[PDB]
Write an enzyme that holds these catalytic residues in place. Structure first.
Site, PDB file in Angstrom:
ATOM      1  N   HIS A  40       0.722  -1.466   0.351  1.00 48.85           N
ATOM      2  CA  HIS A  40       0.491  -0.629   0.060  1.00 48.85           C
ATOM      3  C   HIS A  40       1.159   1.018  -0.165  1.00 48.85           C
ATOM      4  O   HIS A  40       0.274   2.152   0.058  1.00 48.85           O
ATOM      5  CB  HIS A  40      -0.859  -0.013   1.361  1.00 48.85           C
ATOM      6  CG  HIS A  40      -0.909   0.660   2.849  1.00 48.85           C
ATOM      7  ND1 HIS A  40       0.086  -0.508   3.525  1.00 48.85           N
ATOM      8  CD2 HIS A  40       0.416   1.769   3.322  1.00 48.85           C
ATOM      9  CE1 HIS A  40       0.129  -0.084   4.939  1.00 48.85           C
ATOM     10  NE2 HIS A  40       0.705   0.926   4.324  1.00 48.85           N
ATOM     11  N   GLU A  52      20.377   6.766   6.087  1.00 52.18           N
ATOM     12  CA  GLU A  52      19.376   8.247   7.029  1.00 52.18           C
ATOM     13  C   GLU A  52      19.002   8.128   8.612  1.00 52.18           C
ATOM     14  O   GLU A  52      19.194   6.908   8.861  1.00 52.18           O
ATOM     15  CB  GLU A  52      18.052   8.823   6.234  1.00 52.18           C
ATOM     16  CG  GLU A  52      17.685   9.110   4.957  1.00 52.18           C
ATOM     17  CD  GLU A  52      18.516  10.662   4.693  1.00 52.18           C
ATOM     18  OE1 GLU A  52      17.886  11.452   3.708  1.00 52.18           O
ATOM     19  OE2 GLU A  52      18.942  11.352   5.905  1.00 52.18           O
ATOM     20  N   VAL A  57      17.679  17.281   7.012  1.00 52.47           N
ATOM     21  CA  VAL A  57      19.431  17.505   6.513  1.00 52.47           C
ATOM     22  C   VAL A  57      20.742  16.680   6.080  1.00 52.47           C
ATOM     23  O   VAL A  57      20.459  15.541   6.589  1.00 52.47           O
ATOM     24  CB  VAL A  57      20.406  17.816   8.526  1.00 52.47           C
ATOM     25  CG1 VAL A  57      21.223  18.211   8.097  1.00 52.47           C
ATOM     26  CG2 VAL A  57      18.630  19.492   9.258  1.00 52.47           C
ATOM     27  N   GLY A 175       3.211   6.398   8.718  1.00 52.99           N
ATOM     28  CA  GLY A 175       4.520   7.116   8.263  1.00 52.99           C
ATOM     29  C   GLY A 175       5.814   5.479   8.904  1.00 52.99           C
ATOM     30  O   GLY A 175       6.940   5.599   7.657  1.00 52.99           O
ATOM     31  N   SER A 177       4.849   3.318   8.301  1.00 52.73           N
ATOM     32  CA  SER A 177       4.389   1.776   6.917  1.00 52.73           C
ATOM     33  C   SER A 177       5.489   1.398   6.128  1.00 52.73           C
ATOM     34  O   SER A 177       5.925   2.085   5.452  1.00 52.73           O
ATOM     35  CB  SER A 177       3.034   2.253   6.586  1.00 52.73           C
ATOM     36  OG  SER A 177       2.013   2.140   6.832  1.00 52.73           O
ATOM     37  N   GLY A 178       5.435   0.269   6.058  1.00 49.64           N
ATOM     38  CA  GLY A 178       6.391  -0.154   4.791  1.00 49.64           C
ATOM     39  C   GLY A 178       7.967  -0.554   5.538  1.00 49.64           C
ATOM     40  O   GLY A 178       8.508  -1.733   5.117  1.00 49.64           O
TER      41      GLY A 178
HETATM   42  N1  LIG Z   1      -1.371   1.645  14.228  1.00 41.67           N
HETATM   43  C1  LIG Z   1      -0.563   1.327  13.745  1.00 41.67           C
HETATM   44  N2  LIG Z   1       0.499   0.439  13.741  1.00 41.67           N
HETATM   45  C2  LIG Z   1       0.066   1.513  12.836  1.00 41.67           C
HETATM   46  C3  LIG Z   1       0.917   0.990  11.600  1.00 41.67           C
HETATM   47  C4  LIG Z   1       1.183   1.819   9.952  1.00 41.67           C
HETATM   48  C5  LIG Z   1       0.216   2.303   9.882  1.00 41.67           C
HETATM   49  N3  LIG Z   1      -0.280   3.633   8.879  1.00 41.67           N
HETATM   50  C6  LIG Z   1      -1.197   4.153   8.653  1.00 41.67           C
HETATM   51  C7  LIG Z   1      -1.612   4.828   7.451  1.00 41.67           C
HETATM   52  C8  LIG Z   1      -2.906   5.798   7.519  1.00 41.67           C
HETATM   53  C9  LIG Z   1      -2.645   6.616   6.101  1.00 41.67           C
HETATM   54  C10 LIG Z   1      -3.851   7.559   6.494  1.00 41.67           C
HETATM   55  C11 LIG Z   1      -4.155   8.495   5.618  1.00 41.67           C
HETATM   56  C12 LIG Z   1      -4.078  10.459   6.208  1.00 41.67           C
HETATM   57  O1  LIG Z   1      -5.269  10.327   7.355  1.00 41.67           O
HETATM   58  O2  LIG Z   1      -3.301  10.920   5.903  1.00 41.67           O
HETATM   59  C13 LIG Z   1      -5.168   6.435   6.537  1.00 41.67           C
HETATM   60  O3  LIG Z   1      -5.532   6.502   5.241  1.00 41.67           O
HETATM   61  O4  LIG Z   1      -5.414   6.469   7.543  1.00 41.67           O
HETATM   62  C14 LIG Z   1      -2.036   6.214   4.965  1.00 41.67           C
HETATM   63  C15 LIG Z   1      -1.098   5.863   5.180  1.00 41.67           C
HETATM   64  C16 LIG Z   1      -0.224   5.563   3.377  1.00 41.67           C
HETATM   65  C17 LIG Z   1      -0.845   4.660   2.641  1.00 41.67           C
HETATM   66  C18 LIG Z   1      -0.389   4.806   1.569  1.00 41.67           C
HETATM   67  C19 LIG Z   1       1.608   6.366   1.194  1.00 41.67           C
HETATM   68  C20 LIG Z   1       1.464   6.057   2.275  1.00 41.67           C
HETATM   69  C21 LIG Z   1       0.509   5.579   3.628  1.00 41.67           C
HETATM   70  N4  LIG Z   1       1.448   6.598   4.819  1.00 41.67           N
HETATM   71  C22 LIG Z   1      -0.628   4.580   6.212  1.00 41.67           C
HETATM   72  O5  LIG Z   1       0.382   4.154   6.289  1.00 41.67           O
HETATM   73  N5  LIG Z   1      -1.832   4.057   9.728  1.00 41.67           N
HETATM   74  C23 LIG Z   1      -1.020   3.293  10.361  1.00 41.67           C
HETATM   75  C24 LIG Z   1      -1.182   3.114  11.627  1.00 41.67           C
HETATM   76 CA   LIG Z   2      19.806  13.016   6.141  1.00 44.17          CA
END
Ligand SMILES: NC(=[NH2+])c1ccc2[nH]c(-c3cc([C@@H](CC(=O)[O-])C(=O)[O-])cc(-c4ccccc4N)c3[O-])nc2c1
Ligand SMILES: [Ca+2]
Ligand SMILES: [Cl-]
Length: 223
Positions: A40, A52, A57, A175, A177-178
């Site tokens: 995703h 990094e 910076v 942020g 994620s991945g």
């Molecule tokens: N509680 C956790 N353990 C957790 C872990 C990873 C997550 N990654 C995300 C995540 C949330 C979003 C927001 C977006 C927003 O509110 O602006 C959403 O759609 O709820 C987006 C992404 C996401 C979706 C696509 C690409 C990069 C991303 N970071 C998340 O991974 N929530 C997360 C929560």
């Molecule tokens: Ca840097």
């Protein structure tokens, strides 16, 4: 990462930042030319940033390489996030050293109670957004399948596992994620989803990497 701590510059040499003009997901270096992240987090125009610490910076040790191709798992389901994994090939190989190194893939899956290290530049607040400049770390145990399923009834597949704290306060977040979930020096999970961040009884759900090793290996071998 909520309730975590500052890792220390370059103490997690396999962590990468996926960037499209801003940091949007993390990933893991598994060899000098490939990274594993979550499906995703896919998009085009990705620049992979290795070595990094402070992402705003240039302190030195950074290597910015463009992705040559991203391979999302063919069976990835955006609605359930089952098979949330993606491989990214780099345009040129990274120079590996002590600050930039790959992590190993597992041979076996980890057990509940295993303690792992989760890192990333994701949100540090559970209520509101506060993004850090440097990398944050969190030590978290893998929970049992029954506790995971009780928390997310009907949403956990066999390609997911939960790790975290049911009392709330410590979890990965947006942020992050991945990025990597490393236990005993092996990449066992990928930060995938959760309900809010660090909420009580709503632990983090991660992609179970041990179920994808043959796929990762076959796919890299043919690309
Ligand atoms: N509680 C956790 N353990 C957790 C872990 C990873 C997550 N990654 C995300 C995540 C949330 C979003 C927001 C977006 C927003 O509110 O602006 C959403 O759609 O709820 C987006 C992404 C996401 C979706 C696509 C690409 C990069 C991303 N970071 C998340 O991974 N929530 C997360 C929560
Ligand atoms: Ca840097
Ligand atoms: Cl169930």
């Amino acid at each position: 990462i909520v309730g975590g701590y500052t890792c220390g510059a370059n103490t997690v040499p396999y962590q990468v930042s996926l960037n499209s003009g801003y940091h949007f997901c993390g990933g893991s270096l598994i060899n000098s030319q490939w990274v594993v992240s979550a499906a995703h987090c896919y998009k085009s125009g990705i620049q992979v940033r290795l070595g990094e610490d402070n992402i705003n910076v240039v302190e030195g040790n950074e290597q910015f390489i463009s992705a040559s191709k991203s391979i999302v798992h063919p069976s990835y389901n955006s609605n359930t996030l089952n098979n949330d994994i993606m491989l990214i090939k780099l345009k040129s190989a990274a120079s590996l050293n002590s600050r930039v190194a790959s992590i190993s893939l597992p041979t076996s899956c980890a057990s509940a109670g295993t303690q792992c290290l989760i890192s990333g530049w994701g949100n540090t607040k559970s209520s509101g957004t506060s993004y850090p400049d440097v990398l944050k770390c969190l030590k978290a145990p893998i929970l049992s399948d029954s506790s995971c399923k009780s928390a997310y009834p009907g949403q956990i597949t066999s390609n997911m596992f939960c790790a975290g704290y049911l009392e709330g306060g410590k979890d990965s977040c947006q942020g992050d994620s991945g990025g990597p979930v490393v236990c005993s020096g092996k990449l066992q999970g990928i930060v995938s989803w959760g309900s809010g961040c660090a909420q009580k009884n709503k632990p983090g759900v991660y992609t179970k990497v041990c179920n994808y090793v043959s796929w990762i290996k076959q796919t890299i071998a043919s690309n």
